[model samples]
Target: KQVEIFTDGSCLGNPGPGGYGAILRYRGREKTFSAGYTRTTNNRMELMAIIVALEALKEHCEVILSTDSQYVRQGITQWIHNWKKRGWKTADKKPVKNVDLWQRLDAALGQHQIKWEWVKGHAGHPENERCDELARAAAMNPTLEDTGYQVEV
Candidate 1:
């Protein structure tokens, strides 16, 4: 069987309190998850949403994962191969941002056939709107510190 997932991320500040939400739908059954971080970036939260969703799966399955973050969709579909080949560095020779979450997401994607989709945010997609609400609510209630997040020099 295949699953459909929608995800969204929120940050009170660029590097402040952050949260992510994801929904997985399979055969009319739905599962949703969200979490908050004391300090993190929107991009990190975005990546976290998908990672958690995929990690929740117990077996290999086909998935259609949707998100509003181009950072997630584009990085996975278009940029990851080169980043891996270049030892996680960018073409500009700089270290990749949010490498930790990216690596975790990479691992989470194993054992699944994933199809990534990018959706325009705030365009009134029901699940997307709900995910945004979930993320925003969680961001307002951050409980855990994002220890992996590091300040850029």
Candidate 2:
């Protein structure tokens, strides 16, 4: 068990205003960060939360990432291996969705010891609840940049 972090994401519409939140606990202290993506989807925000949390660590560390996103969990530990093997495409050779953000997350995972765990969302877990609140509140910001998100015409 290393530092424990709880992370979450939310959006008004599936691809509308979005945000991500995180709670990182180390020793006897805690740190929190959140931001609006303003124009991304809930899933990208989920990936962003983990990205930000990992990047914030000052050095390599063992991390227990508790999240509700099976997408993130499997993407990191399982699917990514095959996706990379297939030239970043899916098994059927379909181009991968969210390749940009996934690549960024992959790069962020340089050399840290990380454990991914799934928690049932909105299940009254205190840390998870706070992360939800943080994400929702950030989504209220006037605007925020989501580098890879574009609203379809």
Q: Count the backbone clashes (under 3 Å) in each candidate.
A: 0, 0
Error of 2 at 100 (Å): 1.4
Per-model RMSD to reference? 1.4, 2.1
Report the poorest 10 consecutive residues by lDDT, candidate 1. 116-125
lDDT of 1 at 29: 97
Query: Could you tell me how far off, in angstroms, the CA of residue 142 lies in candidate 2 after the best superposition?
Result: 4.7
lDDT leader: 1
The C-alpha local distance difference test score for the whole of candidate 2 amounts to 0.85
Q: In candidate 2, what are the lDDT values of residues 1-153, reduced to their tens digit? A: 378989998889978888889999999699998999768888889998988988888888999889998788778878898888889987667668788888888887776887877898677778989998999998987267887875544
Cα displacement (angstroms), candidate 2, residue 39, comes to 0.9
Cα deviation of 147 in candidate 2 (Å)? Answer: 2.0
Question: Which tens-of-lDDT digit does each residue in 1-153 have in candidate 1?
Answer: 499989998998878999989999999999999999989989888888898899999888899988889888789888888889999988788888888888888988877898877898567678988888999999999998889898977
